[PDB]
Design a protein around this ligand. Sequence first.
Ligand code: CA
Ligand code: CA
Ligand code: CA
Ligand code: CA
Ligand code: CA
Ligand code: CL
Ligand code: CL
Lengths: 308, 306, 304, 305
Amino acid sequence: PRKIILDCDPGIDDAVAIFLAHGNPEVELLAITTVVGNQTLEKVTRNARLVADVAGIVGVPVAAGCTKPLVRGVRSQIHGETGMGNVSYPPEFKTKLDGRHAVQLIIDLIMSHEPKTITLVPTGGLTNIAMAVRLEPRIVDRVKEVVLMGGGYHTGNASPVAEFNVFVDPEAAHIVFNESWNVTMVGLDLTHQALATPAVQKRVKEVGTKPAAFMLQILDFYTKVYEKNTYATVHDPCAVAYVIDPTVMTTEQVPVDIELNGALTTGMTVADFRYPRPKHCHTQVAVKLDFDKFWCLVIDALKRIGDP
Amino acid sequence: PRKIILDCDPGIDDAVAIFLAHGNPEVELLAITTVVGNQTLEKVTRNARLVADVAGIVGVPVAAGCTKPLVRGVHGETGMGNVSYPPEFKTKLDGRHAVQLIIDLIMSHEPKTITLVPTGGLTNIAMAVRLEPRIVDRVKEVVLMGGGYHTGNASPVAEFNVFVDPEAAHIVFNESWNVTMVGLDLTHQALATPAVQKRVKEVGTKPAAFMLQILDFYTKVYEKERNTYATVHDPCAVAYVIDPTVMTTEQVPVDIELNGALTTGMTVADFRYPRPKHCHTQVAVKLDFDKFWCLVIDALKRIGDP
Amino acid sequence: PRKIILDCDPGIDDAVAIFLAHGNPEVELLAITTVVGNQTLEKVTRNARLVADVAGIVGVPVAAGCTKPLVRGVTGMGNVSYPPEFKTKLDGRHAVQLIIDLIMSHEPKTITLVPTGGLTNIAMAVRLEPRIVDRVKEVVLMGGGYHTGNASPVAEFNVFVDPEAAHIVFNESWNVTMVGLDLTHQALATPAVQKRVKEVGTKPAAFMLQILDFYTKVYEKERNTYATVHDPCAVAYVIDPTVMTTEQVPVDIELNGALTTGMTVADFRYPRPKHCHTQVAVKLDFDKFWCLVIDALKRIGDPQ
Amino acid sequence: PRKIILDCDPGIDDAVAIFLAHGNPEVELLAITTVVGNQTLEKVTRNARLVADVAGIVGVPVAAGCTKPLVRGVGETGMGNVSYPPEFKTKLDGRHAVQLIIDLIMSHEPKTITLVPTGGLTNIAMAVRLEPRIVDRVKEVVLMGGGYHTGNASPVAEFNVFVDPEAAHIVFNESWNVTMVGLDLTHQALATPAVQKRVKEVGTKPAAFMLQILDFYTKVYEKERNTYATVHDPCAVAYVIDPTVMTTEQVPVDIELNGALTTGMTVADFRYPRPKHCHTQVAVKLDFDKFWCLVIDALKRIGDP
Ligand SMILES: [Ca+2]
Ligand SMILES: [Ca+2]
Ligand SMILES: [Ca+2]
Ligand SMILES: [Ca+2]
Ligand SMILES: [Ca+2]
Ligand SMILES: [Cl-]
Ligand SMILES: [Cl-]
């Protein structure tokens, strides 16, 4: 399997990504690390433990990371005051909180495993990844690659041109996108295609298990968020899906940089589609989703998880 | 006919726009005004007089405008694209600065009858707006070639006409008048394919040969910027004035980035929903390719050999 | 006398500048041109005509200029009332065109531009007729502040209200003297100065005292100091350059910064450049400055 | 003694700061941590170990920190014209400077450690974001950097802030108390011929080391000067030793990150009315004779180790 670290801020779609990464046999979750986002670090960390309980994830450290973006002030109409819809939390989690800061855990894991065996899969702001890069620069060449859900070369949500994960910590994104490692940006241009349509939702329900139920409950809290004018798009699992099977989406190799200064455009992932296209480029952007293959991967992972 | 003022920086694109405006029966050129860009004001004013000579354009003042952008600073070519200048131009230069000519024409003509058609940097337009604010409500509308909501050429995200004077663009886009942005998203479709160039060649007149010669010169000069055939840009704005069904448009808020490290000069269009009901700006989307080239070839035919 | 064009946004301190320019014989006022500032162009143009009425200024065109800054967004004078009709007529020309016309029609190097408001008219004139730049003698402006701000921690009002226009002016090749806040915060209207103004005993003196009393109330309330009169300092420099010290240093205008937009950035590092077209005013000769102001009020007297 | 951590990029100024902290009885060095600046992290770390050897500093961990700024890109022998020894006596702690800083602050009682940065603020900012509890636990920060009316790296920016403006913005916008000893203060710490002769008369190896390297860099950087050579970084240590060595003013101070001309400026708001609360203050006027007395005294107390 491909070993991954899932760095996230759950978050309903982060939860679906955790389910996909756990249930699919082609990826091995080495850790779930959390970062401040559009819920406080405390809240998304509680949510990550909740998702890990529901999916019965054992043997995988869950470590809390950065409580604040690098430079920007902290930034919930999407995922709830909870971060996880209207779900009931247990009195007690089975999933313990690792004692390490996520940044130290990411470093420890990368430095102890063989080179080029871990893929980083960030699906929140990039603060933890950037901190780890600056605290231990040797991780950059040791990582296999980075596949992040974030950005948008021609679509914004947080602003006309910026996507939330980059927008909440542009400086951290700038750090991640300007290191020499290979980066795949699974941005809004891709993830707006990952539609949780009624048909897809019925297939989710036909699994008939506690995680499928949890998922559709949080997902129609999400669906009523996205109605108020599309179906819920489930962004973050798209990044995990690419690690499972890169043919699930097309990509294009182009330069991508992060705007830090502009009054209208801070947080933009500026992708250069001009000619000539670079024949060697460490960044690529995702373009077209294979919708059927993607939803097949998500439903297969739910079936595999069963009822822990 | 639609009266227009063509503010430009020829430029092969601007030359084709001038031919289209002059040849097409539905446009009345009131002036050709020139502006600095990546070429100097003096060079493009010489080019504009060459274009006017070749098309036989009489009775239309040609006026030189701003020599520098508002705030920003800033080979082997005989004449324009290896077409020599005559020893002296037949077309004279109007004595007035383009900024003053634009004001004078707008204020002296009845209201809501003149369309401004900028196809270079927006410096003259912005100067005229700040010097005589009454022109804004008096102008029918503005149809400019420039910008790009998901495209760039000067940078990954900015187009030349906006990039060379972002401040002037910010002025033009933030006035209350109706603005149609015919950006690179649209003009990338106006490809001068081999079949199109054969039809141009078959017009068989000196302006057609002039257009093809200069287009070829610039197709070779800028070969490294393309993955397909040469395109023409600026005439698309004139075409929109002639027949607005030549392209589709979407009403959307558009603003100009002025202080981005990577994005200065970007036309930032907000496509998010909900889209505002009343937008004074719209962006051009899809070109009617056959109709566009039919208009261009028709204008050349009608110009004939002056 | 040195011919000047006084470009202003009255404004009590602009009023004092107009009085100084009119009353002192070393300067010849060719025009008073107005520009939008903190008050609208219409309002400061009414104020300029009022000030011209009060001082009996005749033969000097008063021309209204730009209604808006280049790019940025935006019961007579203090408590004096306007007359029902001004004696001073509003010129028909836009200030930008009047500035161009005067410069092009006079011999080269005979006119000094004295801006004491936002620089919008000056910048427009520069871009519309670039020949004025080499033709102007120099520019002496009240604006900016190399180590002092008021509109922000680091920006002065006149530059802050139109940074792009200031950038245009400071980056042309003509000679620029920046009389900024570092200098003008010294031009204090102390009780002794106000008593000497009172004792001139003319209607223009009493006008200046009334509006500067309106000004002292707001400077005590908002800055915890006596009233400073900024704009006449720039006129004073044209009258007599020994009224203040200057230092020749590069100066540029910040346009982008989140904290520093509008700042006049002066480079005091060594080595200094041998050829520098900008200089900044530093130390005011207080007694000489206020002497010049009082002498001009006495010369105007109670005018025709 | 007041416990400090000296986070630095030696650097002859930093060397004098280290000598002053080591020789003066009022301060106790808990650690010397290094950060990239104008010279590479590797180089200034070799320099720090050289300085520690020369001063005979034992029992004080020397730890290498960040090799790059947070966001921005980056006859000499060893240090100036002093060659390194074949092996240093002073060993490198194995911890990253950022982890040593956190460990020291978290293991000591609250409000007993003063951070004294004299290089880019990258390590400090990283430690803040990795372990936010350090911010309330630190007694205060006294940094050499910035310039409210003076620049060297640009017309308005000082090198330490300019090399990592983002890390400065982090350090200046935390709630802890910050004293900025900037160029407006330090341009006064002149090393006049009188001072240099007195330093020479101390007659020790550290004194000759300081004079030799300062002379080297004074010649190399003398067209950028209108007067004698200046020491900068020890002024922050001097403040910790005796706050009356310089005057201060409480004013808001922020860091410009997106200016065309002004990125890296410490923007100090001197306008009235001054705010209710200020957690930052700037140094203004130096007690010249007391500062140089303190430096020469530290050199005498160190002796020849
Ligand atoms: Ca997420
Ligand atoms: Ca053009
Ligand atoms: Ca004024
Ligand atoms: Ca010690
Ligand atoms: Ca240092
Ligand atoms: Cl003269
Ligand atoms: Cl000075």
